[PDB]
């Protein structure tokens, strides 16, 4: 209860949190570095241009 | 990280030992109190006996009981003095433990700060390589 | 101080290798819960005697 | 009778702890799933992102 | 893992709901003490559910 | 708070 | 019920759950990915068109 | 590290909010000492938050 040196619950929580925090943070941080590229933000604009020009063709194609 | 990591493990074990010492001091206080309580109880019993002795008609026995009570009182007084000295020491130990608890948390925070500066230094080294 | 310095360097070499070897995650969880599931019963096997 | 009452109080104290310990171990059963799920989620990203 | 833990999260509510039977039936016996102990379980499951 | 809910639940 | 971790009733549930959960989760995930692909969807549309 | 500190800071703020509710609850309860203790805890939390 008071947490003697190897109290199995408390000691396990420490060892898991070491992995849990490091891995999850690495993945979020490295994911933001991989997502940092400006051309990828241009790919969002490109997806906007692509869906809007595809709609213009599509609405004409469905109209007849 | 290596200097910092070793220190954290070491401080926690020391704290447990300190707690045990505090418990012993607390136990000692209880024992002295019990002894003091026993002495008071003994004195009360002696007082009843002294009164009983007078009723009985044995003058010497009553006188002896009074002498015993004085000895018990002296012992009780000594115990009380010992308790007071012990109590001050106990209070200091308790204060230290509370301070230590605050301190260990601060040490953990320090490690995080230390880790960040080291990373910054590594980045500077990379620039030199270029 | 020289013995404390050898303690720094030797205990850090050994503990860094040990913490890297030891600390894969699923090993820890399933041990811990099994150990405390042992312990509750051990406690009851005490406390019964005193109840009685 | 003095001893009996004292140790009865001590036995209640032990039982109060057992009831709390039964919660404390339940919590330790529960977290495992989220931990594994987080771990595996991260490990998928760990492979993915380097490429 | 989402599908699995979502099933478990649904099942925590399914437990809360079933433990209404517990509290309701205890009230239908006049067992307030037992209904309180059911309400403690519905409370602890609610706490659990948020974390999930 | 369990009593407040319980007393309403038993009331009907 | 509570004396040992190795009791048959307690052990069977734990072993069965791990095996069952992994198999169910793996099968569902694989099936969903196949459905997601565009080519499979196109074929289904063609079949409907072919039927009328 | 920034995220962890922020999370810790967020946790401290959350803890402070919980403590504030508890302090108010303590006054309603009539336990004067408990409310005072909560205020002291909040100050410690604030100091930790400031340090963070």
d(CA C42, CA D4): 24
Contact at 8 Å (CB) between D36 and E7? no
Contact at 8 Å (CB) between H7 and H44? no
Chain breaks in chain E (C to N over 2.5 A) after: none
Using the beta-carbon criterion (under 8 Å), do E1 and D40 form an inter-chain contact?
A: yes
Here the tokens at position A4 are 């003697």
Using the beta-carbon criterion (under 8 Å), do H4 and B112 form an inter-chain contact?
A: yes
Here the tokens at position G1 are 């019920």
A-chain residues near D49 (CB < 8 A): 27, 30-31, 34
Give the phi and the psi of residue B80 in degrees, each rounded to 5. Answer: -65, -40
Give the phi and the psi of residue G4 in degrees, each rounded to 5. Answer: -135, 150
d(CA H32, CA B82): 34
Please give the distance of CA A41 from its chain centroid, rounded to a whole number: 15
Using the beta-carbon criterion (under 8 Å), do G2 and C38 form an inter-chain contact?
A: no
Here the tokens at position A20 are 């849990």
CB < 8 Å from D in window 1-52 of C: 25-26, 29-30, 32-33, 36-37, 40, 43-44, 46-47, 50-51
What DSSP designation does C24 have?
Answer: -
Contact at 8 Å (CB) between C23 and A22? no
Here the tokens at position B68 are 């015993």
Q: Where would I find the beta strands (DSSP E) of chain E?
A: none
d(CA C51, CA D7): 9
Using the beta-carbon criterion (under 8 Å), do A30 and D49 form an inter-chain contact?
A: yes
Here the tokens at position H8 are 């810790």
What DSSP designation does G1 have?
Answer: -
Is the minimum CB–CB distance between D23 and chain A shorter than 8 Å? no
In angstroms, how far apart are the furthest CA atoms of chain H? 42
Give the phi and the psi of residue C32 in degrees, each rounded to 5. Answer: -55, -50
Is the minimum CB–CB distance between E35 and chain F shorter than 8 Å? yes
Q: How many residues does chain G have?
A: 52
Is the minimum CB–CB distance between A20 and chain H shorter than 8 Å? no
d(CA B36, CA B81): 11
Is the minimum CB–CB distance between C43 and chain A shorter than 8 Å? no
Using the beta-carbon criterion (under 8 Å), do H44 and B112 form an inter-chain contact?
A: no
Using the beta-carbon criterion (under 8 Å), do E36 and F6 form an inter-chain contact?
A: yes
H-chain residues near B102 (CB < 8 A): 44
Within 10 angstroms of residue B9's Cβ, the number of other Cβ atoms is 10
Q: Give the dihedral of Cα atoms B22, B25, B30, B33; nearest 10 deg.
A: -140
d(CA C14, CA C12): 6
Neighbours of chain G (3+ CB pairs under 8 A): C, E
The CA distance from G32 to the nearest CA of chain C, in Å, is 28
Using the beta-carbon criterion (under 8 Å), do B6 and C8 form an inter-chain contact?
A: yes
Contact at 8 Å (CB) between A22 and C38? no
The conformational region for residue A3 under phi > 0 = left, psi -120 to 50 = alpha, else beta, is left
Is the minimum CB–CB distance between A34 and chain D shorter than 8 Å? yes
Among all chains, which residue has been given the structure tokens 């109840």?
C51
d(CA H15, CA H6): 14
Residue of G nearest to C30 (CA): G14
d(CA B100, CA G13): 46
Is the minimum CB–CB distance between D25 and chain C shorter than 8 Å? yes
Here the tokens at position H19 are 């403590």
The conformational region for residue H31 under phi > 0 = left, psi -120 to 50 = alpha, else beta, is beta
d(CA C30, CA A15): 13
**Nearest-by-Cβ selection for A9 from C23, C25, C32:** C32
**Nearest-by-Cβ selection for D18 from C29, C36, C47:** C47
Contact at 8 Å (CB) between B93 and B21? yes
* Contact present, A and H (at least 3 Cβ pairs less than 8 Å): yes
Give the phi and the psi of residue E31 in degrees, each rounded to 5. Answer: -90, 70
Q: How many residues does chain C have?
A: 52
Contact at 8 Å (CB) between B60 and B107? no
Taking CA atoms, G17 is separated from C37, E6, G20, G22, in Å, by 18, 16, 5, 8
Using the beta-carbon criterion (under 8 Å), do D43 and A26 form an inter-chain contact?
A: no
């Amino acid at each position: 209860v008071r947490g003697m040196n190897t109290s199995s619950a408390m000691s396990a929580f420490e060892r898991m949190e070491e992995k849990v925090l490091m891995q999850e943070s690495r993945a979020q941080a490295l994911g933001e570095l991989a997502g940092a590229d400006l051309e990828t933000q241009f790919a969002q604009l490109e997806g906007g241009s692509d869906v809007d020009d595809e709609l213009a063709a599509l609405k004409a194609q469905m109209l007849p | 990280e290596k200097m910092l990591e070793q220190a954290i493990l070491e401080m926690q074990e020391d704290l447990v030992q300190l707690r045990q010492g505090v418990a012993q001091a607390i136990a000692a206080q209880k024992r002295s109190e019990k002894q003091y309580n026993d002495a008071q109880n003994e004195i009360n019993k002696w007082q009843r006996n002294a009164q009983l002795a007078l009723q009985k008609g044995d003058e010497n026995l009553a006188r002896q009981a009074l002498e015993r009570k004085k000895t018990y009182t002296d012992t009780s007084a000594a115990l009380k003095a010992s308790l007071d000295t012990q109590s001050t020491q106990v209070e200091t130990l308790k204060r230290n433990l509370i301070q230590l608890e605050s301190k260990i948390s601060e040490a953990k925070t320090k490690k995080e700060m230390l880790k960040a500066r080291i990373t910054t230094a590594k980045a500077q080294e990379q620039l030199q390589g270029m | 101080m020289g013995l404390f310095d050898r303690i720094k360097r030797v205990v850090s070499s050994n503990l860094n290798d040990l913490v890297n070897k030891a600390e894969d995650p699923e090993k820890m969880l399933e041990q811990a819960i099994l150990e405390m599931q042992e312990d509750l019963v051990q406690l009851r096997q005490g406390v019964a005697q005193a109840i009685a």
